Structures are given as structure tokens and as C-alpha cells.
């Protein structure tokens, strides 16, 4: 049946985050944190990767 299959496939997609998070929002939020910190690079990449792994 198409509905069950599409729902399960969307669950199995990469970069899918649990606890009601979205990857687009998460990336924009992290960039906003860094820009705000400036207004007041590999280490930030590692922080991002740790977050995405914990929220995967």
C-alpha cells in the first residue's frame, strides 16, 4: 500500500533527526548561534557532527 511504504521510507531517509528536530532548522540555528557570537572552523564542524550524531 503506498501510504505505509512512503511513511516508512521517509522515516528511513538520511539526516532524519529524532525528538522533533529538522536538519534545515538545526543547521540554520547553529549558524545563527555562531553569527550572534561574532556580533557580540573545523572545531565548529566537529560540534555540528556531534550534534547530528546525537540527534540522528
Amino acid at each position: 500500500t503506498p501510504f505505509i511504504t512512503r511513511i516508512m521510507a521517509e522515516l528511513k531517509e538520511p539526516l532524519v533527526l529524532s525528538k522533533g528536530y529538522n536538519i534545515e532548522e538545526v543547521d540554520k540555528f547553529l549558524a545563527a548561534i555562531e553569527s550572534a557570537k561574532r556580533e557580540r572552523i573545523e572545531k565548529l564542524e566537529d560540534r555540528r557532527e556531534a550534534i547530528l550524531r546525537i540527534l540522528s
Binding site: 522533533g20 547553529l30 566537529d46 560540534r47 550534534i51
Partner: protein, 53 residues
Amino acid sequence: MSQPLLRNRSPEESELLKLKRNYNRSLLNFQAHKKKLNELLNLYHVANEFIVT
């Protein structure tokens, strides 16, 4: 005994009630989202100390 047992809710009262209920739902969702982003930020601070490599 003459009074009607129930008086129907007028369309204006219904509209105001729907406004308030939609607001309640939206506010709860927004507060969940705000605390969610806050917890994400508090993890983003301590993410320095997490080994990934």
C-alpha cells in the same frame, strides 16, 4: 420552568472560542519548540568536549 434548558452558542461566541483554542494549541506548540531550541543550544555549548574523531 419557562426558561430554555440550553441556549445555543452564537456564531460570534463560536468564532471567539475557536480563536482562543487555536491560540492555546499554537502557544503550546511554540513553547515546546522554544524549549527544544534551548536544549539544542545547551548541547551546542558542551559539544566541544564530545569526541567524534
